[PDB]
Amino acid sequence: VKELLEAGVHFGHERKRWNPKFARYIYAERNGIHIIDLQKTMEELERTFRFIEDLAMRGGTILFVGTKKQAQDIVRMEAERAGMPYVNQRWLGGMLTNFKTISQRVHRLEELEALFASPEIEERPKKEQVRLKHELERLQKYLSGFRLLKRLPDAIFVVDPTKEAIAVREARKLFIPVIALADTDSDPDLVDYIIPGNDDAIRSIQLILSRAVDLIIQAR
Amino acid sequence: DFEEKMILIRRTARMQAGGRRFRFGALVVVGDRQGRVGLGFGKAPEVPLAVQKAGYYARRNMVEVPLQNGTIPHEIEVEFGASKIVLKPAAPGTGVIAGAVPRAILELAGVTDILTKELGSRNPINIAYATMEALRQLRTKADVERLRKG
Amino acid sequence: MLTDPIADMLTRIRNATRVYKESTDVPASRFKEEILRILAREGFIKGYERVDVDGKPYLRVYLKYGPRRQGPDPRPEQVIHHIRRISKPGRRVYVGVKEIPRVRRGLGIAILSTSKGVLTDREARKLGVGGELICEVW
RNA sequence: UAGCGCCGGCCAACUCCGUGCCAGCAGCCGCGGUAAUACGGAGGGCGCGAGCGUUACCCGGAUUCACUGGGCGUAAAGGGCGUGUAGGCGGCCUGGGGCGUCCCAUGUGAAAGACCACGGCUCAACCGUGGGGGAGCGUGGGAUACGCUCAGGCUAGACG
RNA sequence: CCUGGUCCACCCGUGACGCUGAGGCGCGAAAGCGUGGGGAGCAAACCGGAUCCCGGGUAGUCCACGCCCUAAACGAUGCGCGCUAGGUCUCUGGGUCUCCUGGGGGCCGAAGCUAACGCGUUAAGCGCGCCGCCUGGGGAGUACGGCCGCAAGGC
RNA sequence: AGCUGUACCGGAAGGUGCGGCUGGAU
C-alpha cells in the first residue's frame, strides 16, 4: 500500500450501485460510500502483475481498452509507451469475433493513407478529394491504435468491465484472458485477473496503468 | 479428415409485399468416429450455401466424447426445451438402437453400442441439440475421482 | 409444519451449491449427522461442523467445487450434480439386498438406512443387508 | 409344381401407353380434368415364398391413466370462500417392546411350461434325462437405523 | 354501543397441544321469488316522437323477514412450511433513529424455470405434506336417473 | 370496443336493464 490511498484507489460507489458478487472485496461502508479492502487489492495486484510480467517476457500482446471519457487520454499515452495496441474512442461491436471483416477496413485505411502519400491525387476532382478525405479522418478517428494487431491478442485490459461489457464478452467467447480495473459495481466472475480498485478517480487509473506499463517495459 | 451427415433441409418462407421469400436451413453433423462431434444449423438463400454454412458451424463447434469399448461410461437423461433424450450403455454386439437423428449424431462419435429413447416433443432440431448437450455432459471414473478425491 | 427434515437438508445443500455458496446451515440432528459423514467420506463435501446459532444447535456444511472453467460462463464444475430423496413420508421405499440399485454404473452412490446403521449401497451389498432407501447422489 | 403382394411419402422398388375430377384408388396425408412414378394394362423392379394377402380381436408404438413415468397463469384442468368429521402426514434428546423393515435356516411354491447342460428321433419341430431359479405364504432364531408404539425430558413449530 | 380478524415489543407461561382436510355445517356481487311497507331520482317490458337517438313509464333498484344460491366469483395462479442476489417506491409498528429491524401493497431484476409471453423472497424457482381437478374438438353442461327450490333454475 | 351471470322483449343480422371482467385505446 501507501501509493494507492492518496490516488483515491479505495473509493467505490454508493450503497445503491453495488453488485452483490463484489461483496468479498468491500472492506466497509463509510458516509454512504463503499470502501474497497486494500489488502486484497495489493494481493490480486501482485497476482495480476506476475501474470503480466511472465506474459510480456514471453512476448504476448495486451490490447488496452478504455472507452470512458477520462480514460481515453491515459489509455493513449500508456499504450504509446509500449508496442501494445489500444482502443479508446469507440468499441465497434465485433472487433474480435469478426476480426476478419475489420481487417479489411484496416487494409483499406492503410491503402488510402498510401494514396494520400502518392502524387496521383491530382486526379479525382476536389469533390472526390473531399469524400476520400472525410473517409480518412473517420477511419483515423476510429481505427487508429487498433492498427498494430496483425492477429488476435494474448490478453485484454479493460478500464470499466461493465462499460465495456461487450469487449469482455468477446474476450470470453474466444478464450482470451481478461484483465480489468473493476470496482464496486462490476461482476468479479467474468474477469480472470482482476484489480479491485477505482474506475473513476483519474489519479487511480493513471497510477495503475503507469505501474503496469513500466513493469512491461522493464520485463520486455 | 472428417465425415458429414445431412440430417435435414427445410424451406422456411416469409411474406413480403405481394410475394414470398424462401430460405433454406440445413442441419449437419461432422465427426471422425473417434470421439469428436460437431452439430451445425446453417441458414442460406440456397441449399448448397446452407450446407456449407452448417458444415462451417459444425467444424467451429467441437465436442469430445469419453469412449470406453465404443460405448458410453454411464446412462444420461437430458431435457432440452420440451424434448428429452435417454441414453444408456450396452454390452458389445448390441448396435446403435436409436432414431435417425440420434443415430446420425452417435455414429460419427465412434459410439457403436447404446440404447436410446426420445420423450416429449420430437422436433429433430431440439432432439439433436439435446443429444449434443447430453454428449457434452458425460464423465468417466477418472474425471469423477479427480473431482471428488483427486 | 416442517414435514420432512431430511428432504429439507438435501434441498438446502442443493440450493446452496446452485449459487456457489461456500457454507450452509442446517438444523442439527443425529440422523442428519450420519448422512453428512457418509457424504464427507465419499468426497461430495469439504465437511461438516457442529455449531451454535442463537442458542440452537446447527450443522455447518462446507461445500466443494471444481476448478474455474474457461470460455463463456466460467462457473466451476459441480461436485454434486444431482441429489434426490427416494423414500418420502407418505411413500416409504424399502429394499432387500437383491433390489439395491446401481447408480450411474457405480459412479454415483445410494444411501441406505440398514439395521446395521447408515451405509452406502456398496457397503450394504458387501455386508449383505437391506433397508430404507434414503437418497441417491451423483 | 411357382405362386402372391407391392413400386407418391411413411417403406424396399420407374418407365410407356388407355380414360382425363369419369372410370377408379386410399391405412393416414390425399390422388384423378392432358401424361398420372398414386387410376387400368405392359416392360422392368422390390419383398417373401408352398405360400402370399385381406378382414376381426389382443399387446406394442401410446410417457395417450404417467408406481417405474405426465399435468392444472394463457393450450383441458385450482373447487366462489371459510369452519371442520373420517382419513393422510408430522420438530429435538433418552430408554423399553420388536408391529412394519432387514437377515439366516427350514417347509411349501405339484406335473407339464419358461431358463441352462447333455442326449434320442439321418437335422429341426417334437421328445427324454439332469440341473436350476422363482413372487408369495407358514415355522424357528437374529438385528434396531428408519417408520410404529409405549415411558420420560426439551423449546426452535403452535398457543397463551 | 356491542363484536371479529390482525401487527409489533418484553421473551413471562404450556410443552408438539401441529398441517391439510372427502362428506356435513355456515357465508356467498348483481339479477330473480314469497309475505308487508316504501317509492325522490334512474330505468327491462311497454306507450309515443324523427330516421342506433329523444320524450314518458310498471317491475326493479329501498327497508324488514324468509327463499334463490350463480358469474371474466380473476392474480384466469388451493392451503401450510423450509431454502435461493439485490435495487427502488409506498403504508403501518419498534429502536440506540435519515441507520438498522418487523408485517403488508407495487415496479425492475441474480440463479433458476417456461413452448413463448413472462414469473422471479407477494415464484410460475428448489423440496416435503394433504385436498380438488384434467385425458382431442363438436354433440353438451345436452338427455336420463337422483337430490335441492314456490318458480326460474341449481347440482 | 369486446366478453360474461341473471331478467325481459306483439321493430330481435339481435336490443335493453343491473352488476362484473380486460382476455380493450385515453
Side-chain angles (χ1 to χ4, degrees):
Chain A
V1 288
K2 311 311 200 291
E3 293 86 9
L4 305 173
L5 67 90
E6 59 267 55
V9 159
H10 66 93
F11 295 158
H13 310 333
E14 50 270 25
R15 62 131 292 170
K16 198 199 63 44
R17 290 180 69 191
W18 81 301
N19 189 286
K21 286 187 186 183
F22 204 78
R24 69 175 167 184
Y25 287 128
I26 307 309
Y27 179 39
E29 177 152 40
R30 201 191 308 123
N31 67 29
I33 212 83
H34 279 165
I35 310 299
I36 305 155
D37 207 3
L38 269 183
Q39 294 278 320
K40 297 186 202 77
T41 300
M42 287 303 290
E43 170 49 43
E44 272 291 341
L45 192 56
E46 182 283 329
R47 162 164 142 87
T48 189
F49 270 15
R50 213 201 55 84
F51 160 77
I52 282 177
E53 73 195 55
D54 302 331
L55 179 58
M57 71 92 79
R58 209 165 80 265
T61 186
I62 297 154
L63 178 53
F64 290 91
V65 182
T67 315
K68 313 184 76 54
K69 184 52 67 196
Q70 67 280 13
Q72 298 194 21
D73 308 298
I74 313 165
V75 156
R76 209 189 212 272
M77 305 322 183
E78 290 291 347
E80 290 151 6
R81 202 181 53 198
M84 301 321 138
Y86 71 94
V87 171
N88 76 329
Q89 208 49 45
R90 197 181 89 82
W91 184 277
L92 312 175
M95 279 196 207
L96 265 67
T97 53
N98 201 20
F99 182 70
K100 315 298 177 287
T101 300
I102 312 299
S103 290
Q104 308 200 103
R105 184 52 66 178
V106 159
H107 293 52
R108 169 62 171 182
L109 164 69
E110 70 182 16
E111 76 187 277
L112 185 65
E113 80 176 314
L115 161 70
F116 291 102
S118 161
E120 286 181 346
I121 67 147
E122 277 59 15
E123 215 183 310
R124 315 173 160 278
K126 281 166 175 74
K127 62 193 72 44
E128 197 162 357
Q129 313 295 77
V130 162
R131 295 186 281 279
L132 294 176
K133 278 296 292 174
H134 284 213
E135 287 193 306
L136 182 88
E137 281 84 11
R138 176 173 183 85
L139 264 185
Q140 300 208 23
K141 158 175 183 179
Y142 291 138
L143 271 302
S144 179
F146 178 79
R147 199 190 301 151
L148 311 178
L149 283 167
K150 301 312 147 74
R151 64 172 164 81
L152 276 170
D154 305 283
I156 201 148
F157 205 100
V158 183
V159 164
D160 195 18
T162 67
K163 171 62 192 74
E164 282 95 5
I166 297 99
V168 177
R169 201 187 292 103
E170 285 197 33
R172 292 308 316 219
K173 191 163 214 287
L174 281 168
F175 281 76
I176 287 161
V178 171
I179 317 154
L181 187 47
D183 55 321
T184 56
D185 73 327
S186 303
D187 195 329
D189 302 333
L190 305 178
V191 191
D192 313 310
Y193 303 114
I194 190 162
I195 307 165
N198 206 314
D199 55 345
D200 309 339
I202 297 155
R203 282 181 46 82
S204 58
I205 312 151
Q206 187 280 327
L207 191 141
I208 298 313
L209 258 172
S210 55
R211 294 318 174 92
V213 159
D214 294 10
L215 166 78
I216 296 163
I217 288 305
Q218 70 182 176
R220 203 92 70 90
Chain B
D1 59 325
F2 287 160
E3 289 78 6
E4 291 172 328
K5 288 180 164 290
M6 202 289 302
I7 301 168
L8 64 90
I9 309 153
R10 75 165 171 190
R11 181 258 288 279
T12 66
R14 82 175 180 273
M15 281 299 180
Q16 263 295 284
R20 286 195 279 266
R21 276 54 142 160
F22 305 113
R23 192 184 286 163
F24 294 85
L27 197 58
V28 164
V29 167
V30 165
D32 69 334
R33 314 190 182 258
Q34 287 183 329
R36 313 176 53 66
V37 189
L39 191 142
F41 194 69
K43 284 80 75 171
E46 296 312 315
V47 174
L49 297 173
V51 171
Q52 283 175 15
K53 293 180 68 39
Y56 185 56
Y57 295 140
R59 258 164 197 90
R60 284 207 307 109
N61 185 9
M62 209 80 71
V63 170
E64 301 80 359
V65 180
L67 284 198
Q68 293 81 18
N69 306 112
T71 199
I72 303 298
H74 64 78
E75 75 279 11
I76 204 85
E77 277 207 28
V78 160
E79 68 294 337
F80 188 97
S83 55
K84 292 183 169 72
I85 195 72
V86 185
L87 305 176
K88 185 176 181 181
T94 310
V96 178
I97 312 304
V101 177
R103 183 173 287 165
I105 290 172
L106 288 157
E107 276 190 20
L108 293 194
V111 172
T112 55
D113 300 314
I114 192 169
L115 297 167
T116 83
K117 197 63 172 80
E118 304 169 12
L119 300 176
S121 66
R122 289 189 192 162
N123 196 233
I125 306 153
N126 290 265
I127 287 295
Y129 278 143
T131 317
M132 278 304 300
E133 198 287 333
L135 282 191
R136 204 172 299 117
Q137 215 187 314
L138 286 174
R139 298 297 169 264
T140 53
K141 178 85 85 180
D143 294 330
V144 160
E145 201 56 273
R146 183 196 303 109
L147 261 173
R148 289 183 203 173
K149 305 289 210 69
Chain C
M1 184 63 246
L2 180 62
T3 61
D4 194 21
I6 311 305
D8 183 21
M9 173 194 54
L10 303 187
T11 304
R12 285 205 207 216
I13 283 162
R14 194 193 302 108
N15 291 8
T17 50
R18 195 71 49 83
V19 291
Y20 294 96
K21 276 180 76 188
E22 275 295 340
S23 177
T24 179
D25 297 327
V26 54
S29 55
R30 175 168 298 279
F31 187 72
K32 285 182 208 178
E33 265 164 14
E34 281 306 282
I35 312 301
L36 285 183
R37 74 177 63 255
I38 291 308
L39 275 173
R41 269 211 306 100
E42 290 286 59
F44 282 105
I45 55 178
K46 265 175 171 181
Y48 80 103
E49 168 193 331
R50 304 196 63 179
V51 301
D52 176 42
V53 184
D54 57 309
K56 307 289 98 181
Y58 270 60
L59 291 163
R60 165 152 291 109
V61 181
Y62 297 98
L63 312 159
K64 188 177 295 182
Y65 302 101
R68 179 183 165 91
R69 279 183 56 248
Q70 262 282 357
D73 175 60
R75 297 185 289 181
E77 311 87 330
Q78 287 283 19
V79 181
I80 307 163
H81 305 104
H82 162 281
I83 184 160
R84 275 183 74 249
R85 179 68 184 276
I86 307 283
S87 85
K88 321 161 196 181
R91 198 209 173 197
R92 299 285 186 183
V93 169
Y94 311 104
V95 288
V97 54
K98 300 313 203 287
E99 298 145 33
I100 288 173
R102 293 177 194 271
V103 189
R104 304 275 276 207
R105 321 296 305 175
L107 294 197
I109 71 147
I111 295 172
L112 286 152
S113 176
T114 69
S115 179
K116 289 181 175 286
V118 172
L119 310 172
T120 56
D121 65 314
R122 182 172 315 282
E123 310 165 71
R125 271 199 315 273
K126 188 186 277 178
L127 271 177
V129 288
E132 186 177 352
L133 183 48
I134 300 302
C135 74
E136 81 194 16
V137 180
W138 50 260

